[PDB]
Design a protein around this ligand. Structure first.
Ligand code: HEM
Ligand code: HEM
Ligand SMILES: COC1=C(OC)C(=O)C(C/C=C(/C)CCC=C(C)C)=C(C)C1=O
Ligand SMILES: COC1=C(OC)C(=O)C(C/C=C(\C)CCC=C(C)C)=C(C)C1=O
Lengths: 53, 75, 61, 105, 49, 378
């Protein structure tokens, strides 16, 4: 019965909020990465190679 | 929230009450009482009882199979 | 290259709260490293008593 | 019409009797769960029905309290069971659904 | 020791059956029991670790 | 003006236990809320007096517990009241959740969801409690449990070792569990207040599931005394347990001091987790077992989304009643199986009961509601 949110306006709504939902996810990611010191993900970043090898 | 006087709209309903010091705490207690519990029981057995016996049975069978299983004749 | 400078920071990154956050988080990462090494080296210079001595004892393992 | 319809009708009558709101003088519509659509339909009821509905609920809550029930002759009989709320509820839903269609474009 | 369907090991917590090599054969245990780093210094001695 | 009604402090009391408009027809089943209230305080009070002699060190943990029962004046009742109160806390907890389910009470989303947090919290609380005496069951219980978390991919090993404070359930782990078992019940209380805060926006539901604004009574003579009579009944049950059968619900093995080399053939939880335990081991998988273990509790958060009936309570719904009682009966089976070895009968029945639990709540109960609506021409 979620057919209430299915139409052109809602489709326009979703798009208007995508760059924002996408940028919020970049915030969440880097934020998770930097806070746990994600070895796997971090080692690829040019500077911040404070784990030598 | 809530309060009294702001709950809902009610009209044309009279309520006769009597003081607790003028009536008995246990009127027909055994007289009207027991028939009611039997009636409440009838009303509900067919909905409460069956599931439980199904377990009672699954329990006794389940135990028998288990204990009888740790025994053996030939081979 | 000065009036237009904080202007660009605002235009490209501070306007949206999206970027604003992304920038301080990206900004927290680099800063941590620069402040850590940068302050270690200041703690390093005013001393020279701890593991500068390491070169001796070890290596012979 | 024939054998089958009466059989579905008697199954419905059977559930009704088993459901047991009748025993507390309630009508089916007195048992409906109150969401917004329903809260509005109650609101839209005319004076008489609204008053009757409160007395019924009161009569039942009272019975339900002392865990008693009405004498058999005063149980509400199936299909003498006026669905007083239905037309109001239906229209309130119809109104909401139109709002919802407009909200999509 | 010496319990289970495979004449090796049996873990009573959730029903893990192991064989004489320590391999998982029945139950929810994901891997075989860990084999430690070891060597024999003689015919009567074994140094584990 | 009065004094009760106007004073900042008394207002709160008045609005919660004196003039609070309550439905005139709530029955016992509504008593378990106050009874949980009593159990919470009873657990805190006997819990504090035990902390005045208990030692959180593996060297003296068991001994201090023994020191309490022989030497400390009346230390034994306090200890058994604590132990048995924890069980009383679970019997009440289970009545309460069930009452909510049968009666549709869960439609108060925030209240109920807060209730789920309250369930999890006392569960996390009681688990840590049982480890404290450092008995064989305390240690192996502590071991079997925590280790579940090692099934979480890529993070599980580090997570289990982080809460252990080592590679095993050792010194660091016991002291740790003391601290958390001390602070948790206070937090529970703050949450029980938020629970009651949300509850107050609507007032109580009642057996019929029909609104009761039309017939409310003050909580002030009626439910104060009915709660009183009911707490007295909780005392009877508790005291009957502690002054006549203090080990009846207890495991005689937690009486033998922890031995990290001696694995008892036994190895089972306290009874209140047996159903979840049964669901866990029904799965021939490490991840799935714990994924479904969790889901057997967190499903209470899915319940309001699976309400499908046009009526709120089950009072007028027969088909649904049967399905409900089959859920309770299925939960007896689950606990019974959970308290049994993973050998013959027991595996397949406990396996099918697990499926039934989820088939019932997730598919059968909703379907019944749709059918019932249809029979009523709704
Ligand atoms: C520390 C644990 C809990 C405490 C102290 C607590 C306390 C209470 C109290 C005092 C009431 C009002 C009286 C009553 O109906 O019993 C209540 C009602 C309720 N509780 Fe809890 N409860 C706790 C755990 C739960 C749990 C586990 C749930 C279910 C997830 C739950 C959901 C509800 C709901 C929905 C109601 C409303 C019931 C109705 O009005 O019909 N609470 N609780
Ligand atoms: C903050 C209040 C509480 C304190 C200070 C407290 C303190 C203690 C202490 C010191 C022990 C070890 C002594 C012993 O085993 O008898 C213990 C055991 C235990 N407590 Fe608590 N506790 C409190 C609230 C709770 C709560 C909320 C529960 C959950 C119902 C709980 C359930 C247990 C259990 C199951 C045990 C182990 C069984 C046993 O008695 O041997 N206690 N507690
Ligand atoms: C060793 O004996 C055992 C216990 O006694 C110490 C338990 O208590 C439990 C279950 C405990 C909990 C907390 C399950 C809930 C998990 C979540 C994510 C809500 C199991 C399985 C068990 O085997
Ligand atoms: C009208 O419905 C209600 C009852 O009748 C079923 C109660 O009995 C209680 C009892 C609650 C108490 C005494 C508070 C305990 C909480 C703590 C944290 C100690 C409440 C709130 C209620 O709303």
């Amino acid at each position: 019965m979620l057919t209430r949110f299915l139409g052109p306006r809602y489709r326009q709504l979703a798009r208007n909020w995508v760059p924002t939902a996408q940028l919020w996810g970049a915030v969440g990611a880097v934020g998770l990465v930097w806070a746990t010191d994600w070895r796997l993900i971090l080692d690829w970043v040019p500077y911040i190679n404070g784990k030598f090898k | 929230g809530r309060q009294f006087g702001h709950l809902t709209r009610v009209r044309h309903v009279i309520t006769y009450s009597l003081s607790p010091f003028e009536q008995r705490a246990f009127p027909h207690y055994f007289s009207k009482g027991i028939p009611n519990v039997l009636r409440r029981t009838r009303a509900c057995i067919l909905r409460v009882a069956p599931p439980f016996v199904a377990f009672y049975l699954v329990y006794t069978w389940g135990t028998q199979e288990f204990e009888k299983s740790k025994r053996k004749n030939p081979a | 290259v000065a009036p237009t400078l904080t202007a660009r920071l605002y235009s490209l990154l501070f306007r949206r709260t999206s970027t604003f956050a992304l920038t301080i988080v990206v900004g927290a990462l680099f800063f941590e490293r620069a402040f850590d090494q940068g302050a270690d080296a200041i703690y390093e210079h005013i001393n020279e008593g701890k593991l500068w001595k390491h070169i001796k004892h070890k290596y012979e393992n | 019409v024939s054998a089958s319809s009466r059989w579905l009708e008697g199954i419905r009558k059977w559930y009704y009797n088993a459901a047991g709101f009748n025993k507390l003088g309630l009508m089916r519509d007195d048992t409906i769960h109150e969401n917004d659509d329903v809260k509005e339909a109650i609101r839209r009821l005319p004076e008489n029905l609204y008053d009757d509905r409160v007395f019924r609920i009161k009569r039942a809550l009272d019975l339900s309290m002392r865990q008693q029930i009405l004498p058999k002759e005063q149980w509400t009989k199936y299909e003498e069971d006026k669905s007083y709320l239905e037309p109001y509820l239906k229209e309130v839903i119809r109104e909401r659904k139109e709002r919802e269609e407009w909200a999509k474009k | 020791a010496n319990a289970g369907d495979f004449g090796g090991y049996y873990c009573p917590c959730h029903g893990s059956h192991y064989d004489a090599s320590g391999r998982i054969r029945k139950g929810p245990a994901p891997l075989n029991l860990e084999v430690p780093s070891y060597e024999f210094t003689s015919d009567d001695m074994v140094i584990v670790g | 003006t009065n004094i009760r009604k106007s004073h900042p402090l008394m207002k709160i009391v008045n609005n919660a236990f004196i003039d609070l408009p309550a439905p005139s027809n709530i029955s016992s089943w509504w008593n378990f809320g106050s009874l949980l209230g009593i159990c919470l305080i009873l657990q805190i009070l006997t819990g504090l007096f035990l902390a005045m002699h208990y030692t959180s060190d593996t060297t003296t943990a068991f001994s201090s517990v023994t020191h309490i029962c022989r030497d400390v004046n009346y230390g034994w009742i306090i200890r058994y009241m604590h132990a048995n109160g924890a069980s009383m806390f679970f019997i009440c907890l289970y009545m309460h959740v069930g009452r909510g389910l049968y009666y549709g009470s869960y439609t108060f989303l925030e209240t109920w969801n807060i209730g789920v947090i309250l369930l999890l919290t006392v569960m996390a609380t009681a688990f840590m409690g049982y480890v404290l005496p450092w008995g064989q069951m305390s240690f192996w219980g502590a071991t079997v449990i925590t280790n579940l978390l090692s099934a979480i991919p890529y993070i599980g090993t580090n997570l289990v070792e982080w809460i252990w404070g080592g590679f095993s359930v050792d010194k660091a782990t016991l002291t740790r569990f003391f601290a958390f078992h001390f602070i948790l019940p206070f937090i529970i209380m703050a949450i029980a207040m938020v629970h009651l805060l949300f509850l107050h926006e609507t007032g109580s539901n009642n057996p019929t599931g029909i609104s009761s604004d039309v017939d409310k009574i003050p909580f002030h003579p009626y439910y104060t005394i009915k709660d009183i009579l009911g707490a007295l009944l909780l005392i009877l049950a508790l005291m009957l347990l502690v002054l006549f059968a203090p080990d009846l619900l207890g495991d005689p093995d937690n009486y033998t001091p922890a031995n990290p080399l001696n694995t008892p053939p036994h190895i089972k939880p306290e009874w209140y987790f047996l159903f979840a335990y049964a669901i866990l081991r029904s799965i021939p998988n490490k991840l799935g077992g714990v994924l479904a273990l969790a889901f057997s509790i967190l499903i209470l958060a899915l319940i309001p989304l699976l309400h499908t009936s046009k009526q709120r309570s089950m009072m007028f719904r027969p088909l649904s009643q049967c399905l409900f009682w089959a859920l309770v009966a299925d939960l007896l089976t689950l606990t019974w199986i959970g308290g049994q070895p993973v050998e013959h009968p027991y595996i397949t029945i406990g396996q099918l009961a697990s499926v039934l639990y989820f088939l019932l709540i997730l598919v059968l109960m909703p379907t019944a509601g749709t059918i019932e609506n249809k029979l009523l021409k709704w």
